[PDB]
Amino acid sequence: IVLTQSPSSLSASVQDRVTITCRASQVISNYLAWFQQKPGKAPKLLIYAASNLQSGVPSRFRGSGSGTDFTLTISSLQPEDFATYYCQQYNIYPLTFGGGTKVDIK
Amino acid sequence: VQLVESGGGLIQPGGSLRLSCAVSGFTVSRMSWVRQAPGKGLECVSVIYTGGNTDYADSVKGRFTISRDNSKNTLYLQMNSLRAEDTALYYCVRGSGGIHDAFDIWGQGTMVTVSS
Amino acid sequence: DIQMTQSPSSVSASVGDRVTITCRASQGISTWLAWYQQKPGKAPKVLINAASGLQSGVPSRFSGSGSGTDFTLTISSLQPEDFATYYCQQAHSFPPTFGPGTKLEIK
Amino acid sequence: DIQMTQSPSSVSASVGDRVTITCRASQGISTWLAWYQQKPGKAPKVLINAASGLQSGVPSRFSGSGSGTDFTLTISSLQPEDFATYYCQQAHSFPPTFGPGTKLEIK
Amino acid sequence: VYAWNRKRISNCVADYSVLYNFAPFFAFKCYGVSPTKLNDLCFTNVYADSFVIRGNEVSQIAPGQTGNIADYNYKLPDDFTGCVIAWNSNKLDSKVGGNYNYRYRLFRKSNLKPFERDISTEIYQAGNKPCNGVAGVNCYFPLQSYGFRPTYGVGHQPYRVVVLSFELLHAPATVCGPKKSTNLVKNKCVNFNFNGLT
Amino acid sequence: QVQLVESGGGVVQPGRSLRLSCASSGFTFSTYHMHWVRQPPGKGLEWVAFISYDGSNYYYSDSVKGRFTISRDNSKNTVYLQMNSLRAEDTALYYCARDSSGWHWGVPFDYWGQGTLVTVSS
Ligand SMILES: *[C@@H]1O[C@H](CO)[C@@H](O)[C@H](O)[C@H]1NC(C)=O
C-alpha cells in the first residue's frame, strides 16, 4: 500500500545505463508494474509482474526483483526514451503508485 | 479480528442483562462464553456452534441464554437468577481449533457485578 | 466436572532454568489437555491446544507435556517471559474446566 | 563468577545402588560441565572433562550427565569407591569455579 | 476444495505451451515432466482437477507434501505425475462483502489416500461421548469456511489452481498433441518427416 | 484498432456531479475489468474504483469513499463513473484503464485512454 521510488531525478547521456528502484512496505510477491508517462500523453505500461516485458514494444528496459526490492535498469538509453517512470502494485486491490523518476537530459 | 464486549454493569439481583459482543473480521460460526471470577480461577459458562446448537453451563442451566446474531456478526448473552457466582469477566472466544476442547482469540473482557 | 488438581500453588524461578508445575486429572484423558498464560492486566492466550500436538502462544522451547493422571509443564532455558500465573483447561468432557493455576514471581 | 549450586549437602548410600547428586548453573552452559573426586588425604582427579564427552577418572559405569542448569551425577550398581566428597567445576567463563560439593559416607 | 472437481480429458489434441507462453504463474511447477517436453508426449488420459486454495497452501499441492489441505482433502502421492499451475485471483473470485462460498476440510478422522475426494458432511468428532449428526463439544462440521476479501495480503488472497495429471494406461493413448509445422519444399533433395514417415 | 476513447470532459462546479462516459472499441468489454486512475495537474497517477468482469464486484480507494458510482453496461460498451461531489482538489485529467488481471491470461493496465480534462472551478 506504500511504494517509494528513490531516484527522483536522474540525468543520463545517450548509452548511459540508468537504474531506478521502488520498494514496498509489505511483500507484493512479484506483482509490480512500471510505466513511462511521456509529457503530454497518457502512460504506457512498461513492465508487469516485475520481471516480464509486456507487448514487447519496449525491448531494452529490463527490470527485475521479487518481494520488497524491484529495480528497472535501462540499458543503452536513447534520447527519445526520456520520460517520468512510475510504479504500482497490480494485485492487492487498494492499488497505489510511486512518486516517479524523471530520466532528463544532462 | 478485534473483539469488543460491553453492556455489563453493577445491577440489582434477579436482574437480566444483555452482553453485546462485536465480532470483526470473522463469522460467529464457532464461539463460546468464558468467565473469570475476580481473584479466582476461570469457569466456562456457554458455547454456540455452526449448527446453532447451544450448550449451557452444567453448573448454571437456562439462567444464561446465548444469542448468536450471525446476520449482525455479533453475540449476546441473557442473564437470569443473578447470583454472587455470576459476577465475573466475560470474554468472547473463537476457540482453539474451533472449540476443540478450549478457546483461542479473546475479547477485552466485560465486568459484571451484582449489587443489592 | 472433573476436579482438576494443579501443583505447586506458588513457584519462584530466575533465568536460564526450567520451571516445573504439574496438573493431575480425576479421569485420565488419553491424549488431550490444555495450558494457558495469564499476565496481570493481560488476556489469556493458548499454550497447549488440548494436547493435539505441542502448541503455539510460546516459542517451541516452552513446551511441557504429561499424559493420563500426571500432566506437567516446564519451560526450557530460554529467557522466561515475566513469570505469569498458568492455568490448565480440561480437554474432553463439557464443561471444559480451568485448573486452579500456579502463581509465578521472580527472586 | 557464576554461583554454582549443588544438591544435596550430604548423601549416604551402601552397595549395589545409584547415588544421585545434582548441581545447577546460574547461566546454562550448552554442553560443558566438569565433575571431580576428592578423598580424605587424597588428590582430586578429573571425573567429567567439561562434558566434552563421558570422562575417565572412573570406570564407564560411574557417569552422570545433566544439561545446562539441571546437571546431575549418579554412579551405576558397580561397587562404589570409598564414598568421597564430589565437586562440580564451571566449564565456560573464567574463573572456572568449584561447586560447594556433597559430603559422602557409608551406613 | 472439499468437493474438488475432476474433469476427464481425452481423444483431444492439446497445446500445453498455450498455458506456458504467458509465464506469470505463481507456480507452473511440473513435478512429472518438463513443461517444454509436454507437447510431443502421448498419454491415454489427462485428469484436470481444479480447486480454489489460499496462497500459503499452493505449495502443499505437490507430490509427497503434508499439510491440512494436502492431507484431509486433495492429496497427491510420492509417485504422482503431472504439472501444477496456479495464478492469483483477487478481483475475479474475492468480493468486498466477503466471499464465503469456498469451504475447506479442517477435521478428518482418517487420512485420505492419494487422488481421493470425500464429499461427505458426516460430523467428525475425535472423542467418546457419542456425538450424533448434531455437533457439540468435540463434534464439528468437517468443512469450516474460507473467508476471502480484497484488502487481504498476498498469500491469503484466493489462488485458483489446476492439477493436470497426465496418465498412461495399456490401451492406446489419445491425449497427444505436438505441432512441429514446417512448410514442404518440392523438387529438392530434402530430409522429410511427414506424419511419422522419416 | 484497440482503443478506450473517453468523453464527458468539461468544467464542473464543486458539489455538482457530471457522469464521465468511458467508451470502448475493439474489445470484448465483458471479460476485461475497467478501473479509474486520476493525475492531478503537476502530480502523479492516483487510483479510484474498480468494476469486475460480471459487473458484480466494486472496490473503492480510501481517499474518496462512496462518493462515486462505477457501472459497466456491456451492451452499451461504456463504463460510467459519476462523482456525487467533486472536491476542488480533484481537477485531474481522469484516465480509464483496461485490466485483464485474474484470468491466467492477462497483465494490468494494458492500454489506457486519451483522457478527459475534467475541471473544478469557482
Ligand atoms: C482461457 O484460456 C485459453 C487457453 O489458455 C486462452 O487462450 C483464452 O484466452 C482464455 N480465455 C479467457 C476468457 O480467459
Author numbering:
A (entry chain O): 2 to 107
B (entry chain E): 2 to 117
C (entry chain J), D (entry chain H): 1 to 107
E (entry chain C): 350 to 547
F (entry chain N): 1 to 122
Provide the authors' original text about this structure.
Overall, a broad spectrum of potent and distinct neutralizing antibodies can be induced in individuals immunized with the SARS-CoV-2 inactivated vaccine BBIBP-CorV, suggesting the application potential of inactivated vaccines and these antibodies for preventing infection by SARS-CoV-2 circulating variants. Notably, the broadly neutralizing antibody 6-2C was less competitive and did not compete with the potent antibodies 10-5B and 13-1C, indicating the recognition of distinct epitopes by the antibodies. Structural alignments showed that 6-2C or 10-5B had nearly identical binding modes to WT, BA.1 and BA.4 spike proteins.
6-2C binds to the core with an uncommon epitope between RBD-5 and RBD-7 (Class 3), consisting of residues N343, A344, T345, L371, P373, F374, F375, W436, N437, S438, N439, K440, L441, S443, K444, V445, P499, T500, V503, Q506, Y508, and N343-linked glycans, which has slight overlap with the ACE2-binding site. 10-5B binds to the residues Y449, L455, F456, N477, V483, A484, G485, F486, N487, C488, Y489, and R493 on the receptor-binding motif (RBM). Structural analysis showed that the disruption of hydrogen bonds was mainly due to the S371L/F, S373P, and S375F mutations found in all Omicron subvariants, resulting in a main-chain conformational change of the hairpin loop (residues Y369–C379) harboring these three mutations. Only 2 hydrogen bonds formed between BA.4-RBD F371 and 6-2C. However, its potency was significantly decreased to more than 10,000 ng/ml against Omicron BA.4/5 and its subvariants. The 10-5B/BA.4-RBD interface showed more significant reductions: the number of contacts was decreased to ~65 and the number of hydrogen bonds was only ~1. The S477N and E484A mutations in BA.1 and BA.4 affected the formation of hydrogen bonds of these two RBD sites with 10-5B. The additional mutation F486V found in BA.4 further disrupted more hydrogen bonds by changing the local structure and breaking the hydrogen bond network around the E484–Y489 region.
